[PDB]
Design a binder for these strands. Structure first.
Length: 341
RNA sequence: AUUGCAUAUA
């Protein structure tokens, strides 16, 4: 049951209702779809005084609002465009509920918004609360975004305990749908004193990751953003095994990236691989050009190839226009000869 | 993903 005021506001009997005019009914309006939207909108127009009028009523039951399907937007509003005193007050209502919040559907949205806007000191304080709950957090549909949020906003040295828990896990986590999301963030924001052990666990698993639904994602991330030496390491593993990884669903994609991102020289050595090396009757190319995955790799290959190497690959392909005609996964490889007709 | 893949609120 809602106060007669809230209802009346629902029917739209207040076209110019003001913030002041709702005093004593914040909490109620904040837990209401439209009441919530109304407050949100108003806040922006509101003076510091007006704003504080709202802050007082919500501060008292902040916890409630933070886990509320509608309330949490109101709290987030204060974390962004709000006084430093207010943010600290809210940060303070967080003390001791971080984890439960982080695993919570609306709570986690507030934690994230808080992480972005509150000072380092309250930041680190929040982070701590996750100690010994990292993995549980990482594997949480809610918790994971929070974790990703720390890694990007928080000081990397307040993060060691994270790394610490990832030891002996990197592989398990890179094959997790939420876990691989955290690994990846970590590769972008963390210190070499921390990313050294991760890239290490990863290489020692390359062959497995490259065929994992999620493992490949991590791999592609390194091929696309990592250090040249860490790329080459990956590039070393794909060599000799190009034909097989290409008809695979997930390694297919990784192979394209090795291509797309390898040194000019590596890219020559891989392109040669499918032309020189053999698969029974014809070359690997003959086999790939008609596959449902490898046909993409051929394509990518033609695109990056140096004019010099483009010719052969083409030369090698031309002799089989007869088969590719009769193959759907190869109708693009056909037209591609246009580029080279 | 277009013949081939992943990302939690009104």
């Amino acid at each position: 049951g809602r106060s007669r005021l809230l209802e009346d506001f629902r029917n739209n009997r207040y076209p110019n209702l003001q913030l002041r005019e709702i005093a004593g009914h914040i909490m109620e309006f904040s837990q209401d779809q439209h009441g919530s939207r109304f407050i949100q909108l108003k806040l922006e127009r509101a003076t510091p005084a007006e704003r504080q009028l709202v802050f007082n009523e919500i501060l008292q039951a902040a916890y409630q609002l933070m886990v509320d399907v509608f309330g949490n937007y109101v709290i987030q509003k204060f974390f962004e465009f709000g006084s430093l005193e207010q943010k600290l007050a809210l940060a303070e209502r967080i003390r001791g509920h971080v984890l439960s919040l982080a695993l919570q559907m609306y709570g986690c949205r507030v934690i994230q918004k808080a992480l972005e806007f509150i000072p380092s000191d309250q930041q680190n304080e929040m982070v701590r609360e996750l100690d010994g709950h990292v993995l549980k957090c990482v594997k949480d549909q809610n918790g994971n975004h929070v974790v990703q949020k720390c890694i990007e906003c928080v000081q990397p040295q307040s993060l060691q305990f994270i790394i610490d828990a990832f030891k002996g896990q990197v592989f398990a986590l890179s094959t997790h749908p939420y876990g691989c999301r955290v690994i990846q963030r970590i590769l972008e924001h963390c210190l070499p004193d921390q990313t050294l052990p991760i890239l290490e666990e990863l290489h020692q698993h390359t062959e497995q990751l490259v065929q994992d639904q999620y493992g490949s994602y991590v791999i592609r991330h390194v091929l696309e953003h990592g250090r040249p030496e860490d790329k080459s390491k990956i590039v070393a593993e794909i060599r000799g095994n190009v034909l097989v990884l290409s008809q695979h669903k997930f390694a297919s994609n990784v192979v394209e990236k090795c291509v797309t991102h390898a040194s000019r020289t590596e890219r020559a050595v891989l392109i040669d691989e499918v032309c020189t090396m053999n698969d029974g009757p014809h070359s690997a190319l003959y086999t790939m050009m008609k596959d449902q995955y490898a046909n993409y790799v051929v394509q990518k290959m033609i695109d990056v190839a140096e004019p010099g190497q483009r010719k052969i690959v083409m030369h090698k392909i031309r002799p089989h226009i007869a088969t590719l005609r009769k193959y759907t996964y190869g109708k693009h490889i056909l037209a591609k000869l246009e580029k080279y007709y």
